[PDB]
Design a protein around this ligand. Structure first.
Ligand SMILES: *[C@@H]1O[C@H](CO)[C@@H](O[C@@H]2O[C@H](CO)[C@@H](O)[C@H](O)[C@H]2NC(C)=O)[C@H](O)[C@H]1NC(C)=O
Ligand SMILES: *[C@@H]1O[C@H](CO)[C@@H](O[C@@H]2O[C@H](CO)[C@@H](O)[C@H](O)[C@H]2NC(C)=O)[C@H](O)[C@H]1NC(C)=O
Lengths: 49, 50
């Protein structure tokens, strides 16, 4: 016989913070030996990027 | 396409004072020395050598 109008919340996530990682800087920075040792692993860096 | 990283222009190094002022002038410049058979053993420690 009687009706009640009520409001309820419902929270949904949409997106997290976008991330971009420096690959050869994080692996080891400022070393030519790092370049000569990382360029011979093929593509384990471009795939991640 | 890549990453941008500015390179340092020069290098500096810091280190503490040279204290204790390690005694090398009493051994290398003395008025009297010992004999070859009775040589005196001198030890220098607790001081950064120059
Ligand atoms: C349906 O319910 C509402 C409340 O949920 C009733 O409204 C109340 O009515 C009384 C007397 O009529 C008032 O003193 C209140 O102030 C009212 N409250 C609100 C929030 O409006 C309503 O009367 C009910 N209807 C029936 C037919 O029973
Ligand atoms: C280590 O050497 C530095 C460089 O001289 C000293 O810093 C100053 O030295 C001058 C020269 O004796 C003094 O007049 C200043 O008062 C010193 N600065 C300060 C903030 O004290 C430093 O004192 C030396 N460290 C020592 C003696 O422990």
């Amino acid at each position: 016989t009687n009706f009640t109008i009520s409001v309820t919340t419902e929270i949904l996530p949409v997106s997290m913070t976008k991330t971009s990682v420096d690959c050869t800087m994080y692996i080891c920075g400022d070393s030519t030996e790092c370049s000569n040792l990382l360029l011979q692993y093929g593509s384990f860096c471009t795939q991640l990027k | 396409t890549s990453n941008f990283r500015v390179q340092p222009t020069e290098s500096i190094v810091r280190f503490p004072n040279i204290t204790n002022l390690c005694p090398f002038d009493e051994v290398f410049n003395a008025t009297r020395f010992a004999s070859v058979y009775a040589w005196n053993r001198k030890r220098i420690s607790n001081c950064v050598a120059d």
